[PDB]
């Protein structure tokens, strides 16, 4: 009965991304900024290598329970605060707790589900938690902020975090410190690998595309089409639905089509969709490209996590904390400098030129995935 561990990392990923998206609508209205948004991803980027090394010394359960303790503290602090410095502290602590949760949970999943096919099948479900969290965050925050009050969403999130922590105490039971049997191959050796670098680069560019697309699209919309506020929110919904669908189906479907081919087609499709986005004239023209973008990115992610796990087992020692720290660093890098660089480029040159450059880069990087195919 290892489904409980899958349930733990599903809930930790779900609740963490629920808090990530509930806070974004509330903070600007309550306060009145770029540093605060990027503080979570920057701090999480820095602590990823240290969590990767710490799991090899003491194991996964203590870092996981510690992640819940940091997330619980961050949630209560957000609800009770009202100052900018405390907001920075809380978001930075979430960045630390999210790093712990992501790295330790992914390593524990890779260490519990050792089979190659089952690993991808369960990582699809686990990555579905992120998509569900981003899907249900904003409406949850909106309703509890509308009716009950400002602190109600945070208090309900804290209650769910307490429930999650109690389940963790019952199942994980972080009572003693247990070191891993073998050393894990230091980060310097792994960063010299060209195949790990190719997989990380594909993840980084695919996610950096959407990282720039998401905040830069409403500004172009409100000037080109003069769209209503409700449309600005419901226009990106196809991407979030298609991400869930594609992640959950391609977790199983990528092993038969071939992980390299699924990643290659994902990069090609996301590049073509990003290239066609500037040609749209209204929301109905934007429905299809966003669906394509979400589908392709789900393809890339659900094909590229188990490939990272496979690469460490194929030519290095089977210890997953450091390599999944590398993968998390790849994700955070796109989400840290994404919005600011995107805004700078879209101010220097047009939004269509930014979209064209992103699409061209993705299409040109796409053939690099050919080297990821297995020798036999
Ligand atoms: N790696 C997750 C990429 C992603 C998918 C859907 C989203 O809505 C989003 O903001 C980000």
Give one DSSP letter per residue of 225-270, joined into a string. Answer: T---HHHHHHTSHHHHHHHHHHHHHHHHHHHHH-HHHHHHHHHHHH
- Domain annotation covers residue 229: yes
Asked if residues 259 and 303 have their Cβ atoms less than 8 Å apart, the reply is yes
Asked if residues 126 and 10 have their Cβ atoms less than 8 Å apart, the reply is yes
Instruction: Find out whether 317 is annotated in a ligand binding site.
Output: no
Do 86 and 163 fall into the same domain?
Answer: yes
- Host domain of residue 95: 3-171
Whole-angstrom Cα distance, residue 204 to residue 232?
Answer: 26
CB distance 134 to ligand 1 below 6 Å? yes
Whole-angstrom Cα distance, residue 21 to residue 317?
Answer: 37
CB distance 297 to ligand 1 below 6 Å? yes
CB distance 116 to ligand 1 below 6 Å? no
User: Ligand 1 pocket test: which of 200, 210, 235, 328 has the largest number of ligand atoms within 8 Å of its C-beta?
Assistant: 210
Residue 159's alpha-carbon distances to 33, 72, 102, 187, 313, in angstroms, are: 29, 9, 21, 38, 39
- Domain annotation covers residue 181: no
Q: 151 CB contacts (<8 Å, ≥6 apart)?
A: 79, 80
Whole-angstrom Cα distance, residue 89 to residue 39?
Answer: 9
Closest residue by Cα to residue 41 from 195, 211, 233: 211
Neighbouring CB atoms inside 10 A of 30's CB total 12
Copy the structure tokens of residue 194. 């060209």
Residue 211's alpha-carbon distances to 117, 203, 331, in angstroms, are: 29, 12, 10
Do 330 and 264 fall into the same domain?
Answer: yes
Do 164 and 201 fall into the same domain?
Answer: no
Q: 79 CB contacts (<8 Å, ≥6 apart)?
A: 151, 154, 155, 158
- Domain annotation covers residue 180: no
281-308: b (≥16 Cβ within 10 Å) or e? eebeebeebbbbbbbbbbbbbbbbbbbb
Do 123 and 203 fall into the same domain?
Answer: no
Do 134 and 24 fall into the same domain?
Answer: yes
- Report H helices in the chain: 3-31, 34-58, 61-80, 84-112, 116-146, 152-171, 187-191, 194-224, 229-234, 237-257, 259-276, 283-315, 321-348, 351-365
Asked how this structure was determined, the answer is: cryo-EM
Do 156 and 200 fall into the same domain?
Answer: no
Domain count, the chain: 2
Do 113 and 234 fall into the same domain?
Answer: no
Residue 67's alpha-carbon distances to 15, 103, 153, 157, in angstroms, are: 12, 10, 20, 15
- Domain annotation covers residue 299: yes
Instruction: Find out whether 290 is annotated in a ligand binding site.
Output: no
Closest residue by Cα to residue 6 from 122, 101, 97: 122
- Domain annotation covers residue 8: yes
Do 214 and 343 fall into the same domain?
Answer: yes
Do 167 and 197 fall into the same domain?
Answer: no
Find the CATH number of the domain harbouring 228. Answer: 1.20.1250.20
- Domain annotation covers residue 44: yes
């Amino acid at each position: 009965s290892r489904k409980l561990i899958l349930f733990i990392v599903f809930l930790a990923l779900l609740l963490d991304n629920m808090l990530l998206t509930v806070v974004v609508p509330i903070i600007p209205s309550y306060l009145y900024v770029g540093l605060l948004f990027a503080s979570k991803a920057t701090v999480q980027l820095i602590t990823n290598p240290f969590i990767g090394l710490l799991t090899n010394r003491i194991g996964y359960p203590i870092p996981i329970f510690a992640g819940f303790c940091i997330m619980f503290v961050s949630t209560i602090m957000f609800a009770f605060s009202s100052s900018y410095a405390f907001l920075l502290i809380a978001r930075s602590l979430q960045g630390i707790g999210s790093s712990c949760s992501s790295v330790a949970g992914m390593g524990m999943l890779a260490s519990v589900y050792t089979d190659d096919e089952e690993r991808g099948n369960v990582m699809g479900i686990a990555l579905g938690g992120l998509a569900m969290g981003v899907l249900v965050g904003p409406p949850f925050g909106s309703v509890l902020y509308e009716f009950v009050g400002k602190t109600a969403p945070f208090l309900v999130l804290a209650a769910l975090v307490l429930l999650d922590g109690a389940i963790q105490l019952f199942v994980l039971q972080p009572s003693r410190v247990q070191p891993e049997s073998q050393k894990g191959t230091p980060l310097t050796t792994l960063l010299k690998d060209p195949y790990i670098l190719i997989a990380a680069g594909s993840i980084c560019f695919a996610n950096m595309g959407i990282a720039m697309l998401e905040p830069a699209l409403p500004i172009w919309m409100m000037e080109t089409m003069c769209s209503r506020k409700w449309q600005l929110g419901v226009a990106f919904l196809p991407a979030s639905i298609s991400y869930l669908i594609g992640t959950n189906i391609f977790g199983i479907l990528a092993h038969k089509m071939g992980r390299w081919l699924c990643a290659l087609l994902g990069m090609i499709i996301v590049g073509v969709s990003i290239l066609c986005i500037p040609f749209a004239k209204n929301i109905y023209g934007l429905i299809a490209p966003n669906f394509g973008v979400g589908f392709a990115i789900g393809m890339v992610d659900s094909s590229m996590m188990p490939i990272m796990g496979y690469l460490v087992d194929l030519r290095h020692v089977s210890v997953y904390g450091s390599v999944y720290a590398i993968a998390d660093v790849a994700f955070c890098m796109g989400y840290a400098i994404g919005p600011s660089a995107g805004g700078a480029i879209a101010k220097a040159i047009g939004f269509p030129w930014l979209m064209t450059i992103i699409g061209i880069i993705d299409i040109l990087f796409a053939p690099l995935c050919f080297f990821l195919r297995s020798p036999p």
